[PDB]
């Protein structure tokens, strides 16, 4: 009983006497899933998880300058020159700087200046891909039961490469999984937290950005983003780097959606494809009898947001366990039960029934006789 | 020419049932393989049933298995589709695609009918209520005119001043509110310097319930 | 397993005359057995090409059919007035179904204009009927991007709005769209300010239209 | 001889035989200013400084949120409500969440649900418009001298109230300064410092605003772009502050102007309009008697990046102060000097005269005789 | 005490029918001597209006004239094609000199293009000749606002380039501009690799073209 | 009709002279107050001096005071700016404007002139070196041309294939560099289908030194 009133709900029924089912696992909502003399079954995706991502490229978003240095030539020996031009790692920039007699030079005019910094980055960020390979779902599947709570279930994982599982399901046996671990998209991890971000947005990143290589010594691309050259009044010109872009980047995240990251492992949501085989799965209270005394509800009955009704009965006879006699009316016709066969097991506790009624006016009996329960009850519907 | 012409749309209750039917001209009905695609409001095709040539085979999508039934009467030159146990998911614009089969469904070149729809929903037939777009001050132009609410079913026409003001009207598409009946808009913007001049009524015309309504809108 | 067409871009907006190309990306190989069709409202969808590169009778030669591993692209040379409209990919590759895409939009492209904003407080005769519906209209806007936020005094309203958007405008190929807030008027008079602020990229910063109840 | 061979140099000259001078003070740059029979000078805008601004806008980067309270009601009875949602600084969300028997509500459906939290600034930046009438320009005039060094000059401060001024130039006189302290855009301040930007750029800002009183319980406007709202699976809705914007404005600001502020005052590059009348300022050696000796060159004579020509030399002879004997030559022409009087005043130290010569071929003789010095040049003149 | 009129925008850009509004802001008040010319290159600026509002004989009536205080306003009702030009404000207040604005530039508005770039290296015969010319080339792009960049190996270069820009093209109504950084074949060959970097609003992030020495 | 027409324009050195004139037809000239106005290279207007109808009074703004001087003949019907001591600054192209006028200078509707350019410069005059904007590969769309340096003074004209090729072109406005001379570079895109099928030929044409230079590109 885990999914009624529930927005986020599927049903997926076993066609054509069918003894499989496939459902679709989105995260969030959950699949309630029925085949004919079988239990009805809630499936849920519990989390998805993944490890060992590959780094694709790593941005810097705190960088340093050291080791500067200038050269300056005069207006009339052309242009100056610093061997750290072409040594990597170091970012430059050519200007002119006003030469005379006074800062030591023979004639007077603009002359050739060249500042270059060596650059490092302090704290870098990286989009990592997510592998199909290393994904690993948990499925929660819990049996749509009428076992008393207003309104413990079990679970099995799917690796890629191990896809397949059984979950026990006491008293009512084995069900077997096979899922089919079925984006554009990547993990940017940012100082033990982490975002799920467009990847052409990522690759836009106005950063620097080496390559996922583990090299402690990466050379970075367009290093220049991090630093600012000032030559205001052609006395001189100033370098700084820019401070963490930190700041910044949260801005610009806050659309994203953020992912747990904790040790390496990370959690989805996921969507995982995934079908039910449920041939020993079989019924639990086939072997009662029918129900001889009266019903009445301990509840109103109330419709759920995907047009079932849910009833809650209290059974006040003594035929210890007896299966629940059930069916609507147009002229008798015999119900769609949700919550399949059932069953009281005890005159105390109430039973909780889920079924479909049929659109328009009808009549849901409950009990044998002519005083058993009847609930009227008239289903719309307005809207898909 | 090849063309398939629909009937047999229209409202059907939830759970009721209709007939959809294509008839074919222009070409030997009996070598082309039939198929049912319809459309979903504000949705993409679905591809939903097929039929051979004989009519000795059907294929019907998961979404309409066991409800609804495709047929075929090769003699009178007709395609049929018996639609029964409709809920409301199943409004939408049916669509006929005919096309010459060796094999049993696969075809390459395809003729389409012109479209039916079919509605389904408890909704009974009501007429629209009228309210007014209220204009205020800007004094260079303003916007107001009509709301139409809680009708059922579509359509309705909207026209402004009987007509004769067009330029600088929108009328919006219905919106299906949760109370299963449907909600447009009719707006248009012009000069607040004649305002206070002419007159602005707007027409609504929901010929299902018959109501016509003139509503006349000022400050 | 049923093989699902992934047609891109949702939306492709061009000037008239542009060269334009439509992917759809099949989640299995079809080889060959793809088909494009364009859809003009009003009208059924229209094939314009099949076996991935073949052209159906009577089409211009404008519409071009390449085929790349499970990656398809429909191409028009120059764009016409006509060939504004949505277009499909349908697979026919072994059996039915023969799944459709989900469509690609084709739109005129136009140059950004900001929406003109307007707010419309609940009428008298409705309020009297026992509902209130505020109003708030973004009038000739473009691109279609656009953000409408509803705020109650200090509250920012979800879940109570609809939205509605006319097709783009035959000759300004601009659209319009109209927001409708309604509650019950029990609700909707323990509170004073109703506003609507829009975000769009014409606006340099969100643009808000409020009132306050009853004035 | 402070602005040769500075790029950025202004040349104004005292028409009609005038006593008095209108120059335009760009920091930066520097005029040099000529009238007849009068001293050359060099002015320039030394710093620009303004008090006590008008904060017109003050935008928070730093938010908090406290007080936090929820009210939901459910599916049947309408849309929850909060007194806090009319209290101000208070920033709230409606949304739906899913209600039925579990978390306590009669029948099943989406039920109206509302949070509003307590906005408060914890810290902001202030955009403070710049008073014409506190700014404080001060202006240092030095004499165009040849005065020895190879290239002390006295400042006057100029209040927008008491506009005028007076400049004793020692062995030269005073020289009167009557300037008229002659921008949308804002001084955003933040954090001890400061830029300059555009306003509406400032307007524009997506931040929380409240006006320039000073009351310390202020109401911020558009509280809610400090605030999230996240109800992602219609269980709760939770809402967090953003935390701090200054590193997104740091980023912001890289293209902005820095400004100096230190104390409630802070330093522009102003542009003061100006002029100068020279009444009392009259030239230094015209006692003196012309000059008898020879004169030869220290260096080679250079051109200024304006045209002009500068001219070091030493005179070996004994008249002890004498006139500097110059004139050009196509054919006698008497030359254009910018070092207005030239005078030897003592036989070791060399001279500077900055002259401009004529377009073309010219030729300067220095000193009196035939023996006298003699400079062949060439002006170009290819690009304004 | 010169009285100086600030136009503005500086660039005003419009499509083609659209309502255009050209500001002139006099430095002292000028009372309703001020005079709008339009210049179109080639020919004489045309005066259109005089006295502030006054229509200057054969001009369109789409030309108006307005004045509030020291703020002038030249308004275009439609624009037509003749009328993308530069417009020039005059004053004639007192005495001469009856200063000129600085011109406001309307043109075309289209949608955003983003720019070719191509890069040209140093011709061997201008090498031998002893100078080498880098030439970086962006075409047919709108709007005209762009940033090149020339890097050389590790430095950005400053002061060794010049820009060319184009008119606004008769049917596309895109701008192309030329950068070519000219530098002795001395300093030329002690460095490696030549890039120019573009940046405009058609590119999702600047785009670089470059080459190594000798290739 | 009211027309003004000027003539004098031309190259002259730094510190030379020039002397302007500008006739007069289709008014009674001595009734016009006369006017010059000029506009350097990439700058607006500037108005610089004025005359009254009978030249008894002339106005010069500070930019050419004592170095311009503005006269009148009015029997002859022309007017004149006899222009001492040119410094490369005044390079423009000058303007005289004509007004009737009843008080010195002030007028209301006005006349101009076809306008004249006048260059000062050191700078003699040079032929231009061609070298080649050599293309390389991308194969769709790839751009080549010519460059066309170190020439003075204006201008040159840039043919491509001898007019054969118009569409694709951009020939640059020239540039003035350092030197005093002037560059420009003029580019065609053009499909690499067809970069070793048609031979692109640029015609550099600069008429003042007469050279005429065909430079063939290719990569
Ligand atoms: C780049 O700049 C660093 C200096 O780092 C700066 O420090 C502050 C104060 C600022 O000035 C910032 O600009 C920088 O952050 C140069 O020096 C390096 O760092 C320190 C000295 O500053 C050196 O550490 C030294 O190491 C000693 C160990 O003995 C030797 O061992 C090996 C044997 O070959 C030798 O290679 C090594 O260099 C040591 O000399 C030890 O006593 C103590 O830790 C001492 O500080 C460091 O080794 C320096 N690196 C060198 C010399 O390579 C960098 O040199 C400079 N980069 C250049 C020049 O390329
Ligand atoms: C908003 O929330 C604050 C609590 O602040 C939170 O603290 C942390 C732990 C988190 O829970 C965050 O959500 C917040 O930052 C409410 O309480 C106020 O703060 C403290 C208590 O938490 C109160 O300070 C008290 O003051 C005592 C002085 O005696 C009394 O003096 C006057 C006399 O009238 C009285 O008005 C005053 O309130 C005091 O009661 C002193 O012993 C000691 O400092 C003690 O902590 C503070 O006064 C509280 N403010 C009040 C009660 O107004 C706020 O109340 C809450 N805002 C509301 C409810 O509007």
């Known amino acids: 009983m885990r999914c009624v009133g529930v927005g986020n709900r599927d049903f997926v029924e076993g066609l054509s006497g069918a003894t499989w089912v496939d459902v679709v696992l989105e995260h969030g909502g959950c699949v309630t899933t029925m085949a004919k003399n079988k239990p009805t079954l809630d499936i849920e995706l519990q989390k998805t998880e993944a490890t060992q991502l590959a780094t694709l490229r790593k941005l810097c978003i705190e960088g340093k300058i050291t080791n500067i240095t200038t050269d300056s030539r005069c207006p009339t020996q052309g242009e100056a020159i610093l061997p750290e031009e072409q040594d990597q790692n170091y970012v430059c920039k050519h200007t002119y700087v006003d030469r005379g007699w006074g800062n030591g030079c023979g004639c007077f005019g603009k002359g050739s200046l060249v500042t270059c910094a060596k650059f490092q980055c302090l704290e870098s960020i990286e989009g990592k891909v997510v592998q199909h390979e290393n994904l690993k779902y948990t499925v929660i599947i819990t049996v749509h039961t009428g076992d008393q709570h207003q309104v413990q279930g079990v679970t099995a994982e799917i690796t890629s490469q191990a896809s397949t599982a059984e979950a026990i399901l006491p008293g009512y046996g084995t069900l077997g999984l096979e899922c089919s671990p079925r984006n554009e998209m990547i993990l940017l991890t940012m100082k033990n937290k982490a975002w799920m971000v467009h990847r052409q947005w990522f690759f836009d990143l106005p950063l620097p950005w080496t390559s996922g290589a583990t090299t402690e010594t990466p050379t970075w691309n367009r290093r220049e983003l991090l630093v600012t050259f000032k030559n205001a009044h052609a006395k001189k010109q100033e370098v700084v780097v820019l401070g963490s872009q930190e700041g910044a980047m949260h801005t610009a995240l806050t659309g994203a959606t953020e992912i747990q990251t904790s040790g390496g492992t990370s959690i989805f949501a996921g969507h995982l494809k995934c079908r039910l085989k449920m041939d020993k799965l079989e019924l639990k209270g086939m072997s009662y009898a029918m129900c001889l005394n009266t019903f009445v509800l301990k509840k109103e009955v109330c419709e759920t947001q995907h047009g079932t009704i849910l009833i809650k009965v209290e059974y006040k006879g003594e035929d210890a366990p007896c299966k629940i006699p059930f069916s609507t009316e147009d002229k008798a016709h015999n119900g769609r039960l949700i919550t399949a066969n059932p069953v009281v097991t005890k005159k105390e506790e109430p039973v909780n029934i889920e079924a479909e009624p049929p659109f328009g006016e009808s009549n849901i009996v409950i009990g044998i006789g002519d005083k058993a329960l009847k609930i009227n009850w008239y289903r719309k519907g307005l809207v898909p | 020419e090849v063309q398939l012409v629909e009937s047999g749309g229209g409202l059907v209750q939830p759970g009721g049932s209709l007939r959809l039917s294509c008839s074919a001209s222009?070409?030997?009905?009996?070598?082309?393989?039939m198929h049912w695609v319809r459309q979903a409001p504000g949705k993409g095709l679905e591809y939903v049933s097929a039929?051979?040539?004989?009519?000795?085979?059907?294929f019907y999508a998961d979404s309409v298995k066991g409800r609804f039934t495709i047929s075929r009467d090769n003699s009178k030159n007709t395609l049929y589709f018996e639609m029964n146990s409709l809920r409301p998911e199943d409004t939408a614009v049916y669509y006929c695609v005919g096309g010459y089969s060796n094999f049993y469904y696969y075809y390459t070149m395809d003729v389409w009918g012109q479209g039916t729809t079919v509605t389904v929903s408890s909704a009974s037939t009501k007429g629209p209520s009228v309210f007014p777009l209220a204009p205020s001050s800007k004094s260079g132009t303003a916007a107001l005119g009509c709301l139409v609410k809680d009708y059922f079913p579509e359509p309705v026409t909207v026209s402004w001043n009987s007509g004769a003001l067009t330029s600088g009207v929108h009328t919006f598409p219905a919106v299906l509110q949760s109370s299963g009946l449907y909600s447009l808009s009719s707006v248009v913007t012009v000069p607040s310097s004649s305002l206070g001049t002419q007159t602005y009524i707007c027409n609504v015309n929901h010929k299902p319930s018959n109501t016509k309504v003139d509503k006349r809108v000022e400050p | 397993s049923e093989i699902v067409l992934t047609q891109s871009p949702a939306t492709l907006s061009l000037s008239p005359g542009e060269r334009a190309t439509l992917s759809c990306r099949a989640s299995?190989?079809?080889?060959?057995?793809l088909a494009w069709y364009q859809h003009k409202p009003g009208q059924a969808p229209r094939l314009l090409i099949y076996?991935?590169?073949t052209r159906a009778t009577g089409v211009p030669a404008r519409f071009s059919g390449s085929r790349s591993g499970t990656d398809f692209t429909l191409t028009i040379s120059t764009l016409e007035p006509e060939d504004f409209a949505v277009y499909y990919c349908?697979?026919?590759?072994?059996?039915?179904?023969?799944?459709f895409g989900q469509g690609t939009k084709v739109e005129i492209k136009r140059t950004v204009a900001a929406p003109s904003v307007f707010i419309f407080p609940p009428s008298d005769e409705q309020l009297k009927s026992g509902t209130a519906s505020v109003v708030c209209l973004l009038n000739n806007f473009y691109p279609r991007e656009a953000k409408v936020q509803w705020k109650v005094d200090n509250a920012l309203q979800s879940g109570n709005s609809q939205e509605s958007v006319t097709e783009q405008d035959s000759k300004d190929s601009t659209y319009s769209l109209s927001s409708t807030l309604t509650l019950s008027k029990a609700d909707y008079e323990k509170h004073k300010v109703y506003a609507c602020e829009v975000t769009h990229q014409g606006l340099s910063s969100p643009v808000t239209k409020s009132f306050n109840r009853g004035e | 001889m402070r602005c040769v061979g500075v790029g950025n140099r202004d040349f104004v000259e005292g028409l009609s035989g005038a006593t008095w001078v209108d120059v335009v003070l760009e920091h930066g740059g520097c005029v040099t200013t000529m009238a007849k029979n009068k001293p050359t000078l060099d002015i320039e805008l030394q710093k620009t400084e303004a008090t006590q601004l008008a904060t017109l806008r003050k935008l928070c980067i730093e938010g908090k949120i406290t007080n936090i309270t929820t009210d939901s009601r459910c599916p049947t009875q309408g849309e929850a409500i909060l007194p806090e949602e009319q209290d101000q600084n208070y920033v709230c969300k409606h949304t739906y969440v899913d209600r039925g028997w579990g978390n306590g509500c009669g029948c099943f459906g989406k039920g109206s649900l509302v949070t509003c939290a307590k906005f408060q600034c914890l810290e902001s930046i202030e955009g403070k418009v710049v008073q014409h009438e506190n700014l404080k320009y001060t202006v240092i005039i030095t004499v165009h001298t040849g005065d020895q060094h190879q290239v002390q000059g006295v400042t006057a401060e100029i209040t927008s109230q008491a506009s005028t001024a007076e400049a004793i130039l020692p062995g030269y006189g005073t020289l009167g300064l009557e300037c008229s302290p002659r921008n949308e855009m804002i001084l955003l301040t933040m954090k001890n410092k400061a830029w300059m930007v555009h306003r509406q750029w400032f307007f524009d800002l997506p931040l929380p605003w409240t006006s320039g009183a000073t009351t310390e319980t202020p109401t911020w406007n558009r509280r809610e772009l400090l605030v999230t709202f996240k109800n992602a699976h219609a269980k709760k809705q939770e809402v967090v502050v953003l935390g701090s914007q200054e590193g997104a404005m740091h980023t912001a600001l890289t293209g902005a102007t820095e400004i100096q502020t230190s104390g409630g005052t802070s330093i522009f590059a102003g542009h003061l309009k100006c002029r100068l009348k020279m009444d009392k300022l009259e030239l230094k050696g015209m006692s003196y008697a012309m000059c008898l000796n020879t004169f030869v060159l220290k260096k080679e004579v250079c051109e200024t990046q304006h045209g002009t020509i500068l001219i070091k030399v030493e005179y070996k002879g004994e008249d002890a102060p004498c006139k500097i004997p110059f004139s050009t030559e196509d054919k006698a022409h008497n030359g254009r000097l910018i070092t207005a009087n030239p005078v030897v005043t003592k036989k070791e130290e060399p001279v500077n005269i900055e002259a401009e010569p004529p377009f073309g071929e010219s030729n300067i003789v220095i000193g009196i005789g035939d023996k006298a010095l003699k400079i062949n040049w060439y002006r170009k003149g290819l690009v304004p | 005490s010169e009285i100086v009129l600030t136009q503005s925008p500086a660039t005003l850009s419009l499509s083609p029918g659209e309502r255009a509004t050209l500001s002139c802001?006099?430095?002292?008040?000028?009372?309703?001597?001020?005079?709008?010319y339009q210049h179109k290159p080639g020919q004489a600026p045309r005066l259109?209006?005089?006295?502030?509002?006054?229509?200057?004989t054969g001009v369109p009536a789409r030309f108006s004239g307005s004045r509030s205080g020291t703020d002038f306003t030249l308004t275009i009702s439609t624009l037509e094609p003749e009328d993308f030009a530069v417009?020039?404000?005059?004053?004639?207040?007192?005495?001469?000199?009856?200063?000129?604005?600085?011109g406001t530039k309307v043109e075309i508005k289209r949608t955003v293009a983003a720019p070719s770039v191509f890069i040209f290296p140093p011709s061997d015969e201008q090498l031998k000749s002893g100078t080498a010319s880098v030439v970086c080339l962006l075409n047919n792009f709108y709007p005209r606002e762009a940033k090149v960049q020339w890097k050389v190996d590790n430095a950005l270069q400053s002061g060794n380039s010049q820009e060319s820009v184009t008119e606004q093209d008769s049917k596309d109504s895109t701008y192309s501009l030329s950068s070519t950084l000219t530098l002795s074949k001395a300093d030329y060959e002690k460095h490696k690799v030549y890039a120019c970097e573009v940046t405009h609003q058609g590119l999702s992030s600047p785009v670089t073209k470059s080459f190594n020495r000798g290739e | 009709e009211v027309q003004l027409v000027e003539s004098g324009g031309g190259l002259v050195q730094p510190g030379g002279s020039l002397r302007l004139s500008c006739?007069?037809?289709?008014?009674?000239?001595?009734?016009?107050?006369?006017?010059?106005v000029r506009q350097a290279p990439g700058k607006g207007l500037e108005y610089?001096?004025?005359?009254?109808?009978?030249?008894?009074?002339?106005?010069?703004?500070d930019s050419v005071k004592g170095r311009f001087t503005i006269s009148r003949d009015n029997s002859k019907n022309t007017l004149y700016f006899e222009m001492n001591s040119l410094r490369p600054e005044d390079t423009a192209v000058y303007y005289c404007v004509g007004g009737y006028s009843n008080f010195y200078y002030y007028y209301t509707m006005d006349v101009w002139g076809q306008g004249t350019t006048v260059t000062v410069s050191s700078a003699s005059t040079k032929g231009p070196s061609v070298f080649p904007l050599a293309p390389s590969s991308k194969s769709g769309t790839a751009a080549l041309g010519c460059l066309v340096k170190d020439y003075f003074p204006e201008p040159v004209t840039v043919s491509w294939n001898s007019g054969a090729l118009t569409s694709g072109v951009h020939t640059f406005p020239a540039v003035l560099q350092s030197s005093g001379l002037y560059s420009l570079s003029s580019v065609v895109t053009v499909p690499s289908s067809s970069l070793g099928t048609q031979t692109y030929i640029c015609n550099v044409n600069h008429k003042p030194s007469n050279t005429k230079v065909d430079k063939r590109v290719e990569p």
């Open positions: 039929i051979t040539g004989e009519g000795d085979s059907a």
């Open positions: 299995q190989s079809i080889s060959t057995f």
């Open positions: 076996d991935a590169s």
């Open positions: 222009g070409f030997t009905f009996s070598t082309y393989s």
């Open positions: 349908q697979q026919r590759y072994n059996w039915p179904p023969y799944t």
